[PDB]
Design a protein around this ligand. Sequence first.
Ligand SMILES: [Ca+2]
Length: 128
Amino acid sequence: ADKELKFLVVDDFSTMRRIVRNLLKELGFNNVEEAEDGVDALNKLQAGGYGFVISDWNMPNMDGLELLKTIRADGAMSALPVLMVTAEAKKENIIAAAQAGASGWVVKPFTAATLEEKLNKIFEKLGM
Ligand SMILES: [Ca+2]
């Protein structure tokens, strides 16, 4: 629950990224970087320093699930929480992501209260 925890907000809609970034700031988390797709995020995650990944399920080039599976397979970031963002809960998606290792799901649009409950729950299931 460290306020300086560095977030990576991955989403191909720049407006969605700003929303998430403002929601985060609002909660007290100001260390936020953005990525527009799976590849982009990996390029940034490489540099290190990251602590939390907020990712959109649906992205061109490298989607949310393929990004999560790549992180999880990465020796070094294999343990980064990944909160999946979707516009519609679907059981098969939730199940796919579950097995690939997603830290949770948030259905957009969402409020800061919702984003906070999500984070809190993740921070907790992680003994974090
Ligand atoms: Ca998207």
